[PDB]
Amino acid sequence: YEFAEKILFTEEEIRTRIKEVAKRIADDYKGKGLRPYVNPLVLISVLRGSFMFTADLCRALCDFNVPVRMEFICVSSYGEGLTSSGQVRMLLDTRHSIEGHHVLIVEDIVDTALTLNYLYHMYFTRRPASLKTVVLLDKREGRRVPFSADYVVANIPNAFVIGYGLDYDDTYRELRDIVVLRPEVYA
Amino acid sequence: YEFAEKILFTEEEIRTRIKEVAKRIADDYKGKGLRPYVNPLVLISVLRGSFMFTADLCRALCDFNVPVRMEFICVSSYGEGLTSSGQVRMLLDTRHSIEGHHVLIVEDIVDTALTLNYLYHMYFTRRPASLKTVVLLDKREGRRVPFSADYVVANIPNAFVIGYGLDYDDTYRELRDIVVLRPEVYAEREAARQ
Ligand SMILES: O=P(O)(O)OC[C@H]1O[C@H](OP(=O)(O)OP(=O)(O)O)[C@H](O)[C@@H]1O
Numbered sequence A: 001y002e003f004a005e006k007i008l009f010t011e012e013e014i015r016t017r018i019k020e021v022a023k024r025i026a027d028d029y030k031g032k033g034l035r036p037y038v039n040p041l042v043l044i045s046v047l048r049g050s051f052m053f054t055a056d057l058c059r060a061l062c063d064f065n066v067p068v069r070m071e072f073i074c075v076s077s078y079g080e081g082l083t084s085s086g087q088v089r090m091l092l093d094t095r096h097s098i099e100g101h102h103v104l105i106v107e108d109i110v111d112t113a114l115t116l117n118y119l120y121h122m123y124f125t126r127r128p129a130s131l132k133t134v135v136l137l138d139k140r141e142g143r144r145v146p147f148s149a150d151y152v153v154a155n156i157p158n159a160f161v162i163g164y165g166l167d168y169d170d171t172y173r174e175l176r177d178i179v180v181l182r183p184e185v186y187a
Numbered sequence B: 001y002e003f004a005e006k007i008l009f010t011e012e013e014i015r016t017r018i019k020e021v022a023k024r025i026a027d028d029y030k031g032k033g034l035r036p037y038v039n040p041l042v043l044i045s046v047l048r049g050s051f052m053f054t055a056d057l058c059r060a061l062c063d064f065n066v067p068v069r070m071e072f073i074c075v076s077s078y079g080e081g082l083t084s085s086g087q088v089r090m091l092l093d094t095r096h097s098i099e100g101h102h103v104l105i106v107e108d109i110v111d112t113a114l115t116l117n118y119l120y121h122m123y124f125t126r127r128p129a130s131l132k133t134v135v136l137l138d139k140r141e142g143r144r145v146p147f148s149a150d151y152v153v154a155n156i157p158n159a160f161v162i163g164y165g166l167d168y169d170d171t172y173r174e175l176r177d178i179v180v181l182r183p184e185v186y187a188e189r190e191a192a193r194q
């Protein structure tokens, strides 16, 4: 791992926390009567980074018997200095309607929050029975617009992290652990 | 699982198998000199069902120093049914070009092979340095079109399997094990869908 300045979390620590987050979620929804086919917890996994987080979480949720529905969405930048408001081009949206459904947006990391806030406001207008967010890493200090995630696996300083789905120039997504990219490397 | 007729593979087994499969891929691509940034093995994950196998496979590949670049594409065929629609819907293609690059398509299951047959043909014309496929499960007793994947984790009998990314009407994708869905469960649902 000589491209990393430090180890933030190992696969094990990540695993543990996810299970804790999943258990909290399960309790929080114990009342909503979530049932397969008719009333599942919809996970709108925001591609690409979220793919790894989403895979381990839906399984943790399953441990706690939470019936889920995976929706993968792919967004795209309109270009630098074109929106500011975090507007993104929807390349692939949910296959099913979220209207009347309990929805949970899944992101691997919230930093400036521009996109996540835009998405939250977007799905919010589609009238789901409820709408919350789960994010693996939260850079609380990086906000460019105010935004609070309902569930967070870990808060992190403003370091550039990689691994567990997170990349730098499309590299390192496959790492089992979350680490900090060495400044020597990204230079 | 009360909705299951049986469990074909548990999480542990799938885990060991993916591990062994990754070692093979590692050895096989050794001579290609895969390197991060300059020459990564391009993994094309076929959403949606491929998401889980893809997540665990790239990590197993990482265990063997295989640098990968991830690509998620989406193509639909069975919809929320039990049988192939026949047609394959290209809803999302690669972000970047695969030309000149070493590419490996990652699929959860190959049955009629209409999907992969469609994919392989599309990508072959784009001239990648190489193109191979890895399928978690092969229901070889189901081809509508011929297709031989370069890596198969497991062969399965002709039965509807769910779990580990694989669904029936967007359900059961989160299971840890791969199990056989009872026909009385989808039958009741299909009827409800009717
Ligand atoms: O709040 P922000 O400052 O936007 O930081 C977090 C976002 O950036 C990343 O997505 P990215 O652009 O890397 O897409 P990716 O998930 O496909 O890698 C990450 O994957 C989160 O979406």
Ligand SMILES: O=P(O)(O)OC[C@H]1O[C@H](OP(=O)(O)OP(=O)(O)O)[C@H](O)[C@@H]1O
Binding pocket: B046, B047, B048, B049, B050, B075, B076, B077, B078, B079, B084, B107, B108, B109, B110, B111, B112, B113, B114, B115, B116, B167
């Ligand atoms: O070999 P074939 O007979 O083509 O069938 C196998 C394909 O069908 C399924 O995808 P589906 O269309 O169900 O979409 P999904 O991955 O999004 O569930 C499966 O996930 C493979 O893509």
Ligand SMILES: Oc1ncnc2cn[nH]c12
Binding pocket: A109, A111, A159, A160, A161, A162, A166, A167, A168
């Ligand atoms: O530190 C970080 N690493 C990878 N992707 C992101 C997104 N925002 N900030 C990031």
Ligand SMILES: Oc1ncnc2cn[nH]c12
Binding pocket: B078, B109, B111, B112, B139, B159, B160, B161, B162, B166, B167, B168
């Ligand atoms: O057994 C099966 N379960 C889920 N997807 C598919 C596609 N082909 N065959 C299926």
Ligand SMILES: [Mg+2]
Binding pocket: A046, A047, A048, A049, A050, A107, A108, A109
């Ligand atoms: Mg992201």
Ligand SMILES: [Mg+2]
Binding pocket: A049, A166, A167, A168
């Ligand atoms: Mg990124």
Ligand SMILES: [Mg+2]
Binding pocket: B046, B047, B048, B049, B050, B108
């Ligand atoms: Mg598929």
Ligand SMILES: [Mg+2]
Binding pocket: B049, B078, B079, B166, B167, B168
């Ligand atoms: Mg399917």
